Amino acid sequence: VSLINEGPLPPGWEIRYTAAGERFFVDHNTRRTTFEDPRPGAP
């Protein structure tokens, strides 16, 4: 439950957590990646 029944995921995105203790975002639509959730635009 405690990390498997949390709130809904963002639209058409993936979100991962590295062994360094940091969080990253992944766009399957263009194979792009980023450190945060910025405005839509240039890479």
């Binding site: 991962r16 590295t18 062994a19 940091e22 992944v26 194979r31 990646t33």
Partner: peptide
């Protein structure tokens, strides 16, 4: 944003 870390590579690693 300076500070190199573990690079995120999902689809870009499994291809």
């Amino acid at each position: 944003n300076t500070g190199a870390k573990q690079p995120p590579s999902y689809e870009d690693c499994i291809k």
